[PDB]
Amino acid sequence: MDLTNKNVIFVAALGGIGLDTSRELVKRNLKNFVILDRVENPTALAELKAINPKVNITFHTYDVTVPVAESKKLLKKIFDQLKTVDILINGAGILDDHQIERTIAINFTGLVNTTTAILDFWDKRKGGPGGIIANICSVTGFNAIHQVPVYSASKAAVVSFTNSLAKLAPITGVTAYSINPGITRTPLVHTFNSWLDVEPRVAELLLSHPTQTSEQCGQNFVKAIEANKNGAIWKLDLGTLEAIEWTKHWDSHI
């Protein structure tokens, strides 16, 4: 994927990983960069515009917990305006195992719903051109942080969902791959709640081991986008980019 002249929608572009990925994206000479996030951040918008005045950057308020119809309404308008969209990045996430329902709603259900919505405009069975989805999952979807079992389980769900999307690409025209950061220094991880307070010290302990910065993560994220490998399961950990091989424990044979 040569990002030159492409149109990208990024859900949750303005958080820690999001914004460092966005900084790198706009260095690539996109035609349109459409940010969908819960709250507007004018400072970050100014920053992106200063990095590359050539990119047309637009913002829309978007909360992934809205019903699928509301996502369809917003996406319909963006597709109308732009005519085409090349890539959707689903980046929304929270880390708070005191918020069981909301963790699941944001990290799993919301991602599934934005995906379901955009298929209205991309699905080749409806006359669309197909497209590409990059889902921000997590290494915790491979192997949990067991002190945040709900968070980790929500990420295991979206790892699986993404794998399935990629296997459905011949039918829908929509390829997909997962972006799975290891521990990355952002507001997500500095202080957070463990399930039933099993480990009050969970952030302190987690951060006592090697990590990466959001800049490193963002750099490797855009490299993964540029590789453009349907079904890839990218690990972005300790400043490197690696594709992992999913174990075949079982096969449906369909």
Residue 72 in contact with a copy of itself, rule: CB under 8 A = no
* Contact status: 91 vs ligand NAD (CB under 6 A): yes
Buried residues in 104-127 as b, exposed as e (16+ CB within 10 A) = bbbbbbbbbbbbebbbebbbbeee
By CB under 6 A, name the one of 38, 49, 60, 124 that touches ligand NAD.
38
Angle between helices 110-122 and 149-172 (to 10 degrees): 10
Could you say whether residue 169 binds ligand NAD (CB under 6 A)? no
Contact 10, 91 (CB under 8 A): yes
The answer to whether residue 62 is catalytic is no
16 binds, among a copy of itself, ligand NAD, none (CB under 5 to 8 A by kind): ligand NAD
Q: Does 22 engage in binding with ligand NAD (CB under 6 A)?
A: no
R_g of the chain, CA atoms, integer Å? 17
108 binds, among ligand NAD, a copy of itself, none (CB under 5 to 8 A by kind): a copy of itself
Mark residues 116-155: x for contact with ligand NAD by CB under 6 A, - for none.
--------------------x-x-----------------
Residue 90 in marked binding region: no
Site string for a copy of itself, 173-192 (x = CB under 8 A): ---------xx---------
Alpha helix (H) residue ranges in 62-137? 68-82, 100-104, 110-122
Q: Residues 144, 153: contact at Cβ < 8 Å?
A: yes
Task: Exactly one of 79, 142, 151, 161 is catalytic; name it.
Answer: 151
**Contacting a copy of itself (CB under 8 A), which of 46, 205, 227, 243?**
205
Q: How far is the CB of 192 from a copy of itself (least distance, A)?
A: 13
Q: Specify the amino acid at residue 63.
A: D
Q: Give the separation between CA 110 and CA 93, rounded to whole angstroms.
A: 9
